[PDB]
């Protein structure tokens, strides 16, 4: 999960970045929170925090 | 009248101090992990000179 967690730490700027600075006012579960609202309400959570192995 | 001192069509320029604000915000969130004052009084004086407002008064008369 380290490397996942990782490679979300080297964005450049854009307006998904943005967002996730909003939201963090990186640990997955602030990236699963955004994806939820970008894709819907009605989908489950992608991603659940220490359980990345199945 | 006093509906507009209510507030109920958007301004220049509070829309214009709202995005300087939130554009400091996110320099200083970068950072972390000029543009006039609005008036009061004014207000209503600055709204009865544009011309959207004179075209429709001229039409009643």
């Given at each position: 999960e380290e490397t996942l967690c990782e490679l979300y730490s080297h964005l450049?700027?854009?307006?998904?970045?943005?967002?996730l600075?909003?939201?963090?006012?990186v640990c997955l579960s602030h990236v699963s929170?955004?994806?939820?609202?970008?894709?819907?309400?009605?989908?489950?959570?992608?991603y659940?925090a220490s359980?990345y192995?199945? | 009248?006093?509906?507009?001192?209510?507030?109920?069509?958007?301004?220049?320029?509070?829309?214009?101090?709202?995005?300087?604000?939130?554009?400091?915000?996110?320099?200083?969130?970068?950072?972390?992990?000029?543009?006039?004052?609005?008036?009061?009084?004014?207000?209503?004086?600055?709204?009865?000179?544009?011309?959207?407002?004179?075209?429709?008064?001229?039409?009643?008369?």
């Amino acid at each position: 999960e380290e490397t996942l967690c990782e490679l979300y730490s080297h964005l450049p700027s854009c307006f998904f970045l943005r967002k996730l600075a909003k939201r963090v006012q990186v640990c997955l579960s602030h990236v699963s929170e955004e994806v939820r609202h970008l894709l819907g309400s009605f989908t489950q959570p992608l991603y659940i925090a220490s359980r990345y192995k199945p | 009248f006093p509906l507009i001192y209510t507030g109920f069509l958007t301004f220049r320029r509070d829309e214009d101090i709202q995005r300087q604000a939130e554009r400091t915000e996110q320099q200083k969130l970068a950072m972390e992990s000029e543009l006039k004052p609005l008036n009061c009084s004014s207000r209503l004086m600055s709204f009865l000179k544009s011309p959207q407002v004179k075209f429709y008064w001229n039409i009643a008369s």
